[PDB]
Amino acid sequence: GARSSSYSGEYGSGGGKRFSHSGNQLDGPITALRVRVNTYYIVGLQVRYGKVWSDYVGGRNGDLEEIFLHPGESVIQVSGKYKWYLKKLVFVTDKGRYLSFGKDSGTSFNAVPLHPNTVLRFISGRSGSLIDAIGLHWDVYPS
Ligand SMILES: [Cl-]
């Protein structure tokens, strides 16, 4: 039909419990990221949609890294690495910024939109005390 949405599928394990930011789309485009990291793993994730933060997922012991996107800036590619749990995330923006988090070891993955000229609209995944898995949802913005 007319829709340009696409979904990467889940990268990582089947552990933990599912989360989805699908209901956060209405708040706005992604405008900021919070990624909690310890020495080995991605511990936790929060994403700001417009002005409103998602409900935090993951554990709380770790360095809380945060990146604030520039006005009009979107993510167009996400890569990373996992081994048992998520270990590395790289958010690539349409302003050419490569926003890396975590430690550079594990099985690699690389997710780009399945329809051209769409951007990262929200994320889903699985979590517990760590981030077990992540999935990327792409769409046009504005809608
Ligand atoms: Cl694994």
Side-chain angles (χ1 to χ4, degrees), residues 92-102 104-128:
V92 181
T93 80
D94 54 17
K95 290 190 73 172
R97 298 208 289 158
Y98 281 63
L99 312 171
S100 185
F101 304 88
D104 195 18
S105 162
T107 300
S108 273
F109 71 91
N110 176 72
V112 292
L114 305 185
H115 297 288
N117 309 136
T118 57
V119 303
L120 187 66
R121 195 65 187 72
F122 67 96
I123 65 165
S124 58
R126 306 186 67 82
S127 74

mmCIF file of all heavy atoms in Angstrom, residues 92-128, unseen atoms left out:
data_model
loop_
_atom_site.group_PDB
_atom_site.id
_atom_site.type_symbol
_atom_site.label_atom_id
_atom_site.label_comp_id
_atom_site.label_asym_id
_atom_site.label_seq_id
_atom_site.Cartn_x
_atom_site.Cartn_y
_atom_site.Cartn_z
ATOM 1 N N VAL A 92 23.700 6.015 13.538
ATOM 2 C CA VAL A 92 24.246 6.825 12.456
ATOM 3 C C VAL A 92 23.173 7.807 12.023
ATOM 4 O O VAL A 92 22.072 7.397 11.647
ATOM 5 C CB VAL A 92 24.698 5.948 11.286
ATOM 6 C CG1 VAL A 92 25.264 6.814 10.201
ATOM 7 C CG2 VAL A 92 25.748 4.943 11.720
ATOM 8 N N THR A 93 23.469 9.095 12.060
ATOM 9 C CA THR A 93 22.431 10.080 11.778
ATOM 10 C C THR A 93 22.585 10.672 10.380
ATOM 11 O O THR A 93 23.647 10.600 9.748
ATOM 12 C CB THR A 93 22.412 11.214 12.809
ATOM 13 O OG1 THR A 93 23.443 12.174 12.495
ATOM 14 C CG2 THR A 93 22.561 10.716 14.227
ATOM 15 N N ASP A 94 21.496 11.290 9.911
ATOM 16 C CA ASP A 94 21.526 11.960 8.614
ATOM 17 C C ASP A 94 22.241 13.307 8.645
ATOM 18 O O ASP A 94 22.247 14.018 7.629
ATOM 19 C CB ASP A 94 20.109 12.125 8.044
ATOM 20 C CG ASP A 94 19.132 12.832 8.980
ATOM 21 O OD1 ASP A 94 19.519 13.505 9.959
ATOM 22 O OD2 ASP A 94 17.915 12.708 8.702
ATOM 23 N N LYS A 95 22.858 13.659 9.768
ATOM 24 C CA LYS A 95 23.866 14.713 9.807
ATOM 25 C C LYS A 95 25.278 14.156 9.839
ATOM 26 O O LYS A 95 26.222 14.906 10.090
ATOM 27 C CB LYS A 95 23.650 15.618 11.018
ATOM 28 C CG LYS A 95 22.417 16.477 10.886
ATOM 29 C CD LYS A 95 22.337 17.530 11.977
ATOM 30 C CE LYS A 95 23.356 18.653 11.764
ATOM 31 N NZ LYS A 95 23.159 19.788 12.718
ATOM 32 N N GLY A 96 25.444 12.868 9.587
ATOM 33 C CA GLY A 96 26.760 12.281 9.491
ATOM 34 C C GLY A 96 27.375 11.914 10.809
ATOM 35 O O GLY A 96 28.555 11.540 10.843
ATOM 36 N N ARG A 97 26.612 11.952 11.898
ATOM 37 C CA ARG A 97 27.179 11.662 13.204
ATOM 38 C C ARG A 97 27.094 10.169 13.500
ATOM 39 O O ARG A 97 26.078 9.528 13.230
ATOM 40 C CB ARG A 97 26.452 12.448 14.284
ATOM 41 C CG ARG A 97 26.562 13.961 14.136
ATOM 42 C CD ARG A 97 26.452 14.694 15.460
ATOM 43 N NE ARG A 97 25.091 14.645 15.994
ATOM 44 C CZ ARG A 97 24.790 14.817 17.270
ATOM 45 N NH1 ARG A 97 25.733 15.071 18.155
ATOM 46 N NH2 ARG A 97 23.540 14.753 17.666
ATOM 47 N N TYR A 98 28.158 9.620 14.052
ATOM 48 C CA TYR A 98 28.238 8.215 14.447
ATOM 49 C C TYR A 98 28.302 8.166 15.969
ATOM 50 O O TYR A 98 29.331 8.482 16.568
ATOM 51 C CB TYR A 98 29.461 7.564 13.812
ATOM 52 C CG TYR A 98 29.270 7.197 12.378
ATOM 53 C CD1 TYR A 98 29.028 8.164 11.410
ATOM 54 C CD2 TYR A 98 29.317 5.883 11.977
ATOM 55 C CE1 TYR A 98 28.828 7.810 10.072
ATOM 56 C CE2 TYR A 98 29.124 5.530 10.638
ATOM 57 C CZ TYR A 98 28.885 6.500 9.701
ATOM 58 O OH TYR A 98 28.689 6.196 8.372
ATOM 59 N N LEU A 99 27.182 7.823 16.581
ATOM 60 C CA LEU A 99 26.987 7.880 18.026
ATOM 61 C C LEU A 99 27.135 6.448 18.537
ATOM 62 O O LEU A 99 26.211 5.642 18.409
ATOM 63 C CB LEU A 99 25.617 8.481 18.338
ATOM 64 C CG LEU A 99 25.213 9.787 17.606
ATOM 65 C CD1 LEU A 99 23.765 10.182 17.833
ATOM 66 C CD2 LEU A 99 26.152 10.892 18.007
ATOM 67 N N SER A 100 28.296 6.140 19.098
ATOM 68 C CA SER A 100 28.662 4.806 19.535
ATOM 69 C C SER A 100 28.499 4.673 21.046
ATOM 70 O O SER A 100 28.737 5.610 21.805
ATOM 71 C CB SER A 100 30.115 4.503 19.143
ATOM 72 O OG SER A 100 30.480 3.174 19.438
ATOM 73 N N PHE A 101 28.097 3.477 21.473
ATOM 74 C CA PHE A 101 27.937 3.146 22.876
ATOM 75 C C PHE A 101 28.378 1.708 23.092
ATOM 76 O O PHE A 101 28.052 0.823 22.294
ATOM 77 C CB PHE A 101 26.489 3.264 23.335
ATOM 78 C CG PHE A 101 25.859 4.593 23.089
ATOM 79 C CD1 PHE A 101 25.241 4.853 21.881
ATOM 80 C CD2 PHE A 101 25.808 5.547 24.086
ATOM 81 C CE1 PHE A 101 24.603 6.079 21.646
ATOM 82 C CE2 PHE A 101 25.183 6.775 23.872
ATOM 83 C CZ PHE A 101 24.578 7.042 22.646
ATOM 84 N N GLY A 102 29.073 1.464 24.182
ATOM 85 C CA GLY A 102 29.364 0.099 24.568
ATOM 86 C C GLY A 102 30.742 -0.336 24.135
ATOM 87 O O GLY A 102 31.573 0.455 23.669
ATOM 88 N N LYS A 103 30.972 -1.630 24.280
ATOM 89 C CA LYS A 103 32.261 -2.239 24.012
ATOM 90 C C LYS A 103 32.222 -3.048 22.725
ATOM 91 O O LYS A 103 31.265 -3.802 22.471
ATOM 92 C CB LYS A 103 32.692 -3.131 25.174
ATOM 93 N N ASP A 104 33.312 -2.937 21.968
ATOM 94 C CA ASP A 104 33.421 -3.400 20.590
ATOM 95 C C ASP A 104 33.801 -4.877 20.543
ATOM 96 O O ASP A 104 34.876 -5.272 20.092
ATOM 97 C CB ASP A 104 34.451 -2.553 19.851
ATOM 98 C CG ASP A 104 34.374 -2.707 18.357
ATOM 99 O OD1 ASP A 104 33.336 -3.185 17.860
ATOM 100 O OD2 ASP A 104 35.352 -2.336 17.675
ATOM 101 N N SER A 105 32.889 -5.710 21.017
ATOM 102 C CA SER A 105 33.091 -7.142 20.906
ATOM 103 C C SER A 105 31.747 -7.835 20.844
ATOM 104 O O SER A 105 30.759 -7.374 21.432
ATOM 105 C CB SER A 105 33.929 -7.660 22.074
ATOM 106 O OG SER A 105 33.831 -9.053 22.247
ATOM 107 N N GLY A 106 31.720 -8.953 20.131
ATOM 108 C CA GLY A 106 30.539 -9.768 19.980
ATOM 109 C C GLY A 106 30.131 -9.908 18.524
ATOM 110 O O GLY A 106 30.794 -9.428 17.607
ATOM 111 N N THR A 107 29.018 -10.610 18.331
ATOM 112 C CA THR A 107 28.485 -10.826 16.994
ATOM 113 C C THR A 107 27.926 -9.526 16.427
ATOM 114 O O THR A 107 27.104 -8.879 17.073
ATOM 115 C CB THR A 107 27.383 -11.872 17.052
ATOM 116 O OG1 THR A 107 27.919 -13.111 17.558
ATOM 117 C CG2 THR A 107 26.763 -12.076 15.696
ATOM 118 N N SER A 108 28.345 -9.155 15.215
ATOM 119 C CA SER A 108 27.920 -7.886 14.630
ATOM 120 C C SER A 108 26.553 -7.955 13.963
ATOM 121 O O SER A 108 26.132 -8.987 13.432
ATOM 122 C CB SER A 108 28.917 -7.405 13.582
ATOM 123 O OG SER A 108 29.945 -6.656 14.181
ATOM 124 N N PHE A 109 25.879 -6.807 13.932
ATOM 125 C CA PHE A 109 24.689 -6.650 13.118
ATOM 126 C C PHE A 109 24.646 -5.229 12.583
ATOM 127 O O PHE A 109 25.308 -4.324 13.100
ATOM 128 C CB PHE A 109 23.413 -6.968 13.898
ATOM 129 C CG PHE A 109 23.056 -5.958 14.943
ATOM 130 C CD1 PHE A 109 22.239 -4.898 14.637
ATOM 131 C CD2 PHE A 109 23.519 -6.092 16.240
ATOM 132 C CE1 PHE A 109 21.896 -3.961 15.610
ATOM 133 C CE2 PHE A 109 23.180 -5.169 17.220
ATOM 134 C CZ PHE A 109 22.366 -4.099 16.901
ATOM 135 N N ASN A 110 23.865 -5.064 11.515
ATOM 136 C CA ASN A 110 23.737 -3.774 10.850
ATOM 137 C C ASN A 110 22.338 -3.656 10.274
ATOM 138 O O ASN A 110 21.955 -4.451 9.416
ATOM 139 C CB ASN A 110 24.761 -3.610 9.740
ATOM 140 C CG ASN A 110 24.582 -2.328 8.998
ATOM 141 O OD1 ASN A 110 24.868 -1.258 9.520
ATOM 142 N ND2 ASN A 110 24.071 -2.419 7.786
ATOM 143 N N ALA A 111 21.599 -2.654 10.717
ATOM 144 C CA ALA A 111 20.201 -2.494 10.342
ATOM 145 C C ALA A 111 20.030 -1.179 9.607
ATOM 146 O O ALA A 111 20.417 -0.121 10.129
ATOM 147 C CB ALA A 111 19.295 -2.526 11.560
ATOM 148 N N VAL A 112 19.466 -1.253 8.404
ATOM 149 C CA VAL A 112 19.068 -0.044 7.675
ATOM 150 C C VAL A 112 17.611 -0.179 7.254
ATOM 151 O O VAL A 112 17.075 -1.283 7.140
ATOM 152 C CB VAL A 112 19.957 0.192 6.425
ATOM 153 C CG1 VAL A 112 21.354 0.549 6.870
ATOM 154 C CG2 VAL A 112 19.987 -1.023 5.534
ATOM 155 N N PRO A 113 16.959 0.954 6.998
ATOM 156 C CA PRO A 113 15.536 0.893 6.613
ATOM 157 C C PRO A 113 15.345 0.080 5.339
ATOM 158 O O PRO A 113 16.155 0.118 4.413
ATOM 159 C CB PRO A 113 15.148 2.363 6.426
ATOM 160 C CG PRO A 113 16.466 3.105 6.361
ATOM 161 C CD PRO A 113 17.425 2.335 7.164
ATOM 162 N N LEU A 114 14.246 -0.674 5.298
ATOM 163 C CA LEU A 114 13.930 -1.436 4.107
ATOM 164 C C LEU A 114 13.257 -0.587 3.034
ATOM 165 O O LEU A 114 13.224 -1.003 1.872
ATOM 166 C CB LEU A 114 13.048 -2.634 4.468
ATOM 167 C CG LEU A 114 13.622 -3.565 5.546
ATOM 168 C CD1 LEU A 114 12.688 -4.779 5.715
ATOM 169 C CD2 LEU A 114 15.069 -4.014 5.276
ATOM 170 N N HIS A 115 12.723 0.590 3.390
ATOM 171 C CA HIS A 115 12.294 1.547 2.380
ATOM 172 C C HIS A 115 13.203 2.753 2.407
ATOM 173 O O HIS A 115 13.544 3.243 3.490
ATOM 174 C CB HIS A 115 10.856 2.002 2.599
ATOM 175 C CG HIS A 115 9.871 0.887 2.488
ATOM 176 N ND1 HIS A 115 9.551 0.294 1.285
ATOM 177 C CD2 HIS A 115 9.180 0.216 3.435
ATOM 178 C CE1 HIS A 115 8.687 -0.679 1.498
ATOM 179 N NE2 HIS A 115 8.437 -0.742 2.792
ATOM 180 N N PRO A 116 13.607 3.259 1.244
ATOM 181 C CA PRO A 116 14.594 4.339 1.222
ATOM 182 C C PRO A 116 14.009 5.629 1.772
ATOM 183 O O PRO A 116 12.794 5.844 1.775
ATOM 184 C CB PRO A 116 14.951 4.461 -0.264
ATOM 185 C CG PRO A 116 13.753 3.969 -0.977
ATOM 186 C CD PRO A 116 13.142 2.902 -0.109
ATOM 187 N N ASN A 117 14.899 6.479 2.287
ATOM 188 C CA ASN A 117 14.504 7.800 2.769
ATOM 189 C C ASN A 117 13.441 7.701 3.860
ATOM 190 O O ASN A 117 12.500 8.497 3.936
ATOM 191 C CB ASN A 117 14.038 8.673 1.599
ATOM 192 C CG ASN A 117 15.049 8.690 0.449
ATOM 193 O OD1 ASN A 117 14.681 8.578 -0.719
ATOM 194 N ND2 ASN A 117 16.328 8.831 0.785
ATOM 195 N N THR A 118 13.591 6.708 4.718
ATOM 196 C CA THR A 118 12.870 6.673 5.980
ATOM 197 C C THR A 118 13.894 6.704 7.115
ATOM 198 O O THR A 118 15.096 6.504 6.909
ATOM 199 C CB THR A 118 11.948 5.452 6.083
ATOM 200 O OG1 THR A 118 12.691 4.238 5.923
ATOM 201 C CG2 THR A 118 10.840 5.504 5.008
ATOM 202 N N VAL A 119 13.411 6.963 8.330
ATOM 203 C CA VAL A 119 14.291 7.187 9.471
ATOM 204 C C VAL A 119 13.842 6.306 10.634
ATOM 205 O O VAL A 119 12.734 5.753 10.633
ATOM 206 C CB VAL A 119 14.312 8.661 9.917
ATOM 207 C CG1 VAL A 119 14.733 9.561 8.774
ATOM 208 C CG2 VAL A 119 12.973 9.086 10.435
ATOM 209 N N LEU A 120 14.683 6.213 11.656
ATOM 210 C CA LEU A 120 14.349 5.443 12.850
ATOM 211 C C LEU A 120 13.203 6.131 13.576
ATOM 212 O O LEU A 120 13.345 7.271 14.021
ATOM 213 C CB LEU A 120 15.556 5.313 13.779
ATOM 214 C CG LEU A 120 15.309 4.378 14.967
ATOM 215 C CD1 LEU A 120 15.117 2.958 14.493
ATOM 216 C CD2 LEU A 120 16.478 4.449 15.929
ATOM 217 N N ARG A 121 12.057 5.451 13.705
ATOM 218 C CA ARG A 121 10.882 6.045 14.320
ATOM 219 C C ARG A 121 10.664 5.610 15.758
ATOM 220 O O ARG A 121 10.149 6.394 16.573
ATOM 221 C CB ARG A 121 9.646 5.699 13.480
ATOM 222 C CG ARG A 121 8.436 6.528 13.782
ATOM 223 C CD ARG A 121 8.655 7.998 13.434
ATOM 224 N NE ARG A 121 7.529 8.804 13.892
ATOM 225 C CZ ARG A 121 7.265 9.101 15.167
ATOM 226 N NH1 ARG A 121 8.060 8.689 16.136
ATOM 227 N NH2 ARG A 121 6.207 9.843 15.462
ATOM 228 N N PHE A 122 11.023 4.373 16.086
ATOM 229 C CA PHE A 122 10.976 3.891 17.470
ATOM 230 C C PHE A 122 11.734 2.567 17.548
ATOM 231 O O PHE A 122 12.144 1.991 16.530
ATOM 232 C CB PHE A 122 9.527 3.742 17.983
ATOM 233 C CG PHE A 122 8.720 2.667 17.309
ATOM 234 C CD1 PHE A 122 8.617 1.402 17.881
ATOM 235 C CD2 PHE A 122 8.012 2.928 16.151
ATOM 236 C CE1 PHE A 122 7.822 0.415 17.277
ATOM 237 C CE2 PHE A 122 7.223 1.964 15.542
ATOM 238 C CZ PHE A 122 7.140 0.701 16.095
ATOM 239 N N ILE A 123 11.969 2.114 18.774
ATOM 240 C CA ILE A 123 12.652 0.848 19.003
ATOM 241 C C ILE A 123 11.769 -0.066 19.838
ATOM 242 O O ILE A 123 10.846 0.364 20.545
ATOM 243 C CB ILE A 123 14.012 1.020 19.696
ATOM 244 C CG1 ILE A 123 13.855 1.583 21.095
ATOM 245 C CG2 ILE A 123 14.940 1.901 18.835
ATOM 246 C CD1 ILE A 123 15.088 1.438 21.900
ATOM 247 N N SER A 124 12.099 -1.351 19.770
ATOM 248 C CA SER A 124 11.512 -2.409 20.573
ATOM 249 C C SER A 124 12.657 -3.320 20.978
ATOM 250 O O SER A 124 13.799 -3.113 20.570
ATOM 251 C CB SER A 124 10.453 -3.175 19.788
ATOM 252 O OG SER A 124 11.007 -3.726 18.610
ATOM 253 N N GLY A 125 12.374 -4.328 21.795
ATOM 254 C CA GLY A 125 13.429 -5.260 22.146
ATOM 255 C C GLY A 125 13.027 -6.131 23.316
ATOM 256 O O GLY A 125 11.836 -6.361 23.559
ATOM 257 N N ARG A 126 14.021 -6.581 24.068
ATOM 258 C CA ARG A 126 13.804 -7.393 25.265
ATOM 259 C C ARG A 126 14.810 -6.945 26.311
ATOM 260 O O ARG A 126 15.942 -6.603 25.979
ATOM 261 C CB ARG A 126 13.953 -8.890 24.972
ATOM 262 C CG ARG A 126 13.086 -9.408 23.841
ATOM 263 C CD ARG A 126 13.169 -10.932 23.712
ATOM 264 N NE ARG A 126 12.565 -11.588 24.869
ATOM 265 C CZ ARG A 126 11.260 -11.815 25.040
ATOM 266 N NH1 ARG A 126 10.364 -11.435 24.129
ATOM 267 N NH2 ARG A 126 10.847 -12.424 26.152
ATOM 268 N N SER A 127 14.409 -6.976 27.588
ATOM 269 C CA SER A 127 15.282 -6.491 28.646
ATOM 270 C C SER A 127 14.998 -7.217 29.952
ATOM 271 O O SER A 127 13.931 -7.799 30.148
ATOM 272 C CB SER A 127 15.130 -4.982 28.875
ATOM 273 O OG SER A 127 13.928 -4.637 29.531
ATOM 274 N N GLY A 128 15.965 -7.124 30.854
ATOM 275 C CA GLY A 128 15.883 -7.626 32.204
ATOM 276 C C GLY A 128 16.744 -6.737 33.072
ATOM 277 O O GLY A 128 16.478 -5.534 33.194
#
